[PDB]
Amino acid sequence: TGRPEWIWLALGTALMGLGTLYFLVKGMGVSDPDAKKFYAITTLVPAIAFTMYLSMLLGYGLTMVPFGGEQNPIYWARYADWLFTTPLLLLDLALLVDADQGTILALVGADGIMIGTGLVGALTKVYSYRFVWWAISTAAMLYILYVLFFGFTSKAESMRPEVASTFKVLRNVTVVLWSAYPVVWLIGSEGAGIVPLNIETLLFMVLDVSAKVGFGLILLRSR
Amino acid sequence: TGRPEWIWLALGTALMGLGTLYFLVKGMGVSDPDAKKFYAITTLVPAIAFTMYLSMLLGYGLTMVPFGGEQNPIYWARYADWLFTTPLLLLDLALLVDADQGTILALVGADGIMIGTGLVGALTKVYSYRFVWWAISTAAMLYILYVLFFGFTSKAESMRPEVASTFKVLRNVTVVLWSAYPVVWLIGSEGAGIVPLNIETLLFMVLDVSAKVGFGLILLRSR
Amino acid sequence: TGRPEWIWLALGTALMGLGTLYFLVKGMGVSDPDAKKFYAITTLVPAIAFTMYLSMLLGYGLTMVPFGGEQNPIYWARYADWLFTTPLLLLDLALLVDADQGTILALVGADGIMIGTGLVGALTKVYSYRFVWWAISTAAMLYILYVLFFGFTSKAESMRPEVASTFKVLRNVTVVLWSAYPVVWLIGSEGAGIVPLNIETLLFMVLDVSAKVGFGLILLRSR
Ligand SMILES: *C\C=C(C)/C=C/C=C(C)/C=C/C1=C(C)CCCC1(C)C
Ligand SMILES: *C\C=C(C)/C=C/C=C(C)/C=C/C1=C(C)CCCC1(C)C
Ligand SMILES: *C\C=C(C)/C=C/C=C(C)/C=C/C1=C(C)CCCC1(C)C
Fold it and tell me: What are phi and psi of A151, to 5 degrees?
């Protein structure tokens, strides 16, 4: 219990676990081949995040990185969490509009370099270089959101009216949640070191719970 | 040769290698698109396990973890082995019954958290927490075997009579092999520390050879 | 700037980055579902390699391995680069001939053991064992090139005349680029220690740029 941010990690663990339970219950009795696919995706994300937060809570997913003159605690498991869940979330958005195979490859490929290079920067000791990697990651993020705002919204307007507006909603939710992460990274202890780790951990917990449970609550209650 | 369990690692390496050779020979001349798919899966598993056991034999795949008052040797490569092969095995069982896409995603997703969290527990230093991760892993295992016993056996009874009984057999073999692993983990040096590492290594070698060669011998000699 | 081979790492970073930019520009306006698939693949490779070389340049992707009586610098990120790009390249060659699903699984599976076991050997401290892993890796390489020379060239002669000769070309380019890697490994500081790290790094940069940009230049300018 030596880490004062642990309460957020505890809240974070608990909400992911229950989030997993809700989707698990709701998905029972679904025989429609398509919905079964969406529920398969939409349940796996909080189950992974649960194990990650529990790792973070229990302390297994964090190491010490010397930069800025300090021994900075780095929740490397938070990055492992993102690497496993953001491509699942991307599939949930692409399958919606029935994207071609190639856009899915590039979108998930864009997504891996984003999260991989942030971790690179997150473990990077030379203070200046840390932000080189932050720039590369955020450029990747821009490719993702460009594809989902000007490539998918086109595909949405030719499909069903139920999937159109349903995508419009989740597209917008995606736009504003994803873009807050690099901001919080930049002002936190991994970047400029203004916001403290404790606050930073709180900020990442609320976003993760919103992105990993709330996103599915939207989708799984859609026609 | 400092490790007395090395003989099992050596036997283990040798049987995986020959297992790989048999399936490689048997698969020559197969032009049927489907069987080619099964043989692709059914050969890759022993080839990976070979490299892992050889790593374990040669010692590259093992580290020391302090718990229970000792510096416990941990064959982390055995866990790497499982993470690469159990989802291949799962595909071999799902493709059999022609499962929908979503059940395959959830089954392999269930399977990754199982093996990932066991490794987490296997490297976990705080003795009590080790079994927290064991509980999470085994819960995942139950989801897998639930899906394969009450979801696939239904899909098996509507397909071909050759694939029905052929799945019935491999379903049962899966049920009893997979469930022995968490038991052996629990009584071995990674858990309760009753069974010695040497015995433990023997137990994991016989199960791995059965699960990775024998399983394919069943499947690859089926209509 | 302590590493004299850094100039090659710098050249290497710069060419990957521009390579990424060219394919990105060229792929704009492509609405054909198939070409979009090829461009998705053909752009991701230099974007990954860019980040890897930049990691190598910036130094994040290299560690020290004691063997042969020295503390050998090991660019582990160069191996991470290959593990992410060679299966993409393999898809670019298989999708060309419209290979069945099973050959793709085995080819990419062959490809992972190749790169995984080389890294194993590359980090292996006991000098003799290093070449055990080199032998296992090269055997994998032979399986890949066997499949692409006697299995795909057959599939090429029954498809379109535009894809036939286009595959003939890229098949041959693949044959001679891939096979130079284990040679350079063998004569470099990771193996026999004749060629110096500086030269070795130069050799791997020219091959990587040829394999990761030039290969796509061929393919993306084909009918
Ligand atoms: C858990 C769910 C989601 C949507 C997680 C999203 C995370 C990101 C978009 C992370 C982005 C980063 C960028 C673009 C650059 C700074 C480092 C980050 C990895 C935080
Ligand atoms: C190599 C082939 C197979 C089928 C390997 C199976 C391994 C498992 C089912 C492992 C299970 C575990 C559980 C459920 C909990 C304790 C830790 C383990 C990873 C051993
Ligand atoms: C970046 C693009 C390509 C095509 C990279 C290819 C790398 C290889 C074929 C590596 C092969 C190895 C073998 C077969 C054995 C020695 C160790 C290596 C990993 C270099």
Answer: -115, -40
